[PDB]
């Protein structure tokens, strides 16, 4: 059946860095953007809502505005990759990626953020 997988279900990230978290989904030949849905969320917060090839930014949570990007070039490889820049302490938690292309699935990914500490 249609299955999403995660290479890594835990990312440990430095405060202030950029992170790219990924989920894999099955692709064959044409990927019809009309039929594809990619959604990323954390807690009650929408991050990406990519539907019929368009992102709805109206629904995106304010904390991710101008910080969050779907790497849409990765989609032909079967990779829904979310890049978050300038990672905050508040970015730590459980993220969900949901992909629909006929069938639908999701997975969890945990992000831990290391607070700034001088060696």
């Amino acid at each position: 059946a249609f299955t999403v997988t995660v290479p890594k279900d835990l990312y440990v990230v430095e405060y202030g860095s950029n992170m790219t978290i990924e989920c894999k989904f099955p692709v064959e030949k044409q990927l019809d953007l009309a039929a594809l849905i990619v959604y990323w969320e954390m807690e009650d917060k929408n991050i990406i809502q990519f539907v019929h090839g368009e992102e709805d930014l109206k629904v995106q949570h304010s904390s991710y505005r101008q910080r969050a990007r779907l790497l849409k070039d990765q989609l032909s490889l079967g990779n829904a990759a979310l890049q978050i820049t300038d990672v905050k302490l508040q970015d730590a938690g459980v993220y969900r990626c949901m992909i629909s292309y006929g069938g639908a699935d999701y997975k969890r990914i945990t992000v831990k953020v290391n607070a700034p500490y001088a060696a």
């Binding site: 959604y39 969320e41 809502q49 539907v51 629904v59 949901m98 629909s100 639908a104 999701y106």
Partner: peptide, 13 residues
């Protein structure tokens, strides 16, 4: 959309 996977719900907007 309103999609349910393993008793978790995903909804637009």
């Amino acid at each position: 959309f309103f999609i349910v996977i393993r008793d978790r719900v995903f909804r637009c907007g």
